[PDB]
Amino acid sequence: ATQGVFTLPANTRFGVTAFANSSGTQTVNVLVNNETAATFSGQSTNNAVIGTQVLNSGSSGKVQVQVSVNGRPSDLVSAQVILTNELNFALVGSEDGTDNDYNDAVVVINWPLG
Amino acid sequence: ATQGVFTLPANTRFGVTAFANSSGTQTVNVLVNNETAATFSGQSTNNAVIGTQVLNSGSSGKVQVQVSVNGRPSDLVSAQVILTNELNFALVGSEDGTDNDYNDAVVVINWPLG
Ligand SMILES: *C(=O)C[C@@H]1O[C@@H](C)[C@@H](O)[C@@H](O)[C@@H]1O
Ligand SMILES: *C(=O)C[C@@H]1O[C@@H](C)[C@@H](O)[C@@H](O)[C@@H]1O
Ligand SMILES: [Ca+2]
Ligand SMILES: [Ca+2]
Ligand SMILES: [Ca+2]
Ligand SMILES: [Ca+2]
């Protein structure tokens, strides 16, 4: 099934943050309305933040997260969680190798802000 | 019900990251084995990271997140979500006022690392 695609409320500010836990350099692309709005790149095996950004969901609200390592797309896992019917989380995990820990690039999207 | 308390695997490294979305300074306390392991403090209305760190779940694996503003404890919402039976997220939201957006301090715990 398709992973890493989330439908946010339109024209809403959201935060996106990426962590790295891999020997390979992780590249995270954040797509809004099917067009690249942010790109994070970095390497770390200690959960270092390779990028954090505030974006706008745009007119369609469609937000897609893509992860790649040296041009090869990573396998993604994703889910959305809503707490007390207000606080939203869009979580993405990714695997670039064989150990299947799916933390090589961890992307957290949270909204609302402010 | 009790919120902000998660049972992690024992002696396991985990990342903890806090965001701020409020006019008040957020004080986030991360407890391990009922003892304060880390304290984040900052103010932001644009989802700025007021703290990110790698900690150890300890001999019991008990991790508690506490949030307070000007000494007054905030109301917490929390849940844990596991993706592909391996990737773990512990999420915390907090409310310091009356608008009930529960993003004033957002804490995300993720494991495993590396
Ligand atoms: C090799 O590059 C694979 C890779 O890096 C390891 C340090 C570990 O994080 C593994 O999960 C990751 O896929
Ligand atoms: C005011 O101090 C309350 C406070 O700050 C606002 C800017 C908004 O973020 C609100 O949710 C927060 O509780
Ligand atoms: Ca991996
Ligand atoms: Ca890894
Ligand atoms: Ca609030
Ligand atoms: Ca707020």
Residue numbers in the entry:
A (entry chain B), B (entry chain A): 1 to 114
Quote the authors verbatim.
Herein we report the first X-ray crystal structures of mixed chirality α-helices in short peptides comprising only natural residues as the example of a stapled bicyclic and a linear membrane disruptive amphiphilic antimicrobial peptide (AMP) containing seven l- and four d-residues, as complexes of fucosylated analogs with the bacterial lectin LecB. The mixed chirality α-helices are superimposable onto the homochiral α-helices and form under similar conditions as shown by CD spectra and MD simulations but non-hemolytic and resistant to proteolysis. To get a direct insight into the structure of AMBP bp65/bp69 and their linear analogs ln65/ln69, we performed several crystallization studies using either the compounds themselves or their racemates to be crystallized as pure compounds, or their fucosylated derivatives of both mirror image peptides as complexes with the P. aeruginosa lectin LecB. While previous reports of similar mixed chirality AMPs concluded on either unordered conformations or helical conformations appearing in a membrane environment based on deconvolution of FTIR spectra, here we reported X-ray crystallographic evidence of short mixed chirality helices consisting of only natural residues existing as helix bundles within the protein environment of a lectin and almost perfectly superimposable with their parent homochiral α-helices. These direct observations unequivocally demonstrate that the α-helical fold with only natural residues can sometimes tolerate multiple stereochemical inversions without significant conformational changes.
The same was true across the ten different X-ray structures of linear α-helices observed in the X-ray structures of LecB complexes for the homochiral Fln65 and its mixed chirality analog Fdln69 (RMSD < 0.9 Å). This comparison showed that the helical geometries of the homochiral and heterochiral helices were not significantly different from each other. A similar α-helical fold was observed for the corresponding linear mixed chirality peptide ln69 and the homochiral sequence ln65. Surprisingly, the mixed chirality sequences bp69 and ln69 showed similar CD spectra and an even stronger α-helical signal as their homochiral parents in 5 mM DPC although they contained 7 l- and 4 d-residues (ESI†). To test whether the α-helix was stabilized by the bicyclic staple, we repeated the MD simulation with linear analogs ln65 and ln69, which again showed rapid unfolding in water but refolding to a stable α-helix at the DPC micelle surface for both the homochiral linear peptide ln65 and the mixed chirality linear peptide ln69. The mixed chirality linear AMP ln69 showed comparably strong antibacterial activities but reduced hemolysis and much stronger stability against serum proteolysis compared to its homochiral parent ln65, similar to previous reports with mixed chirality AMPs.
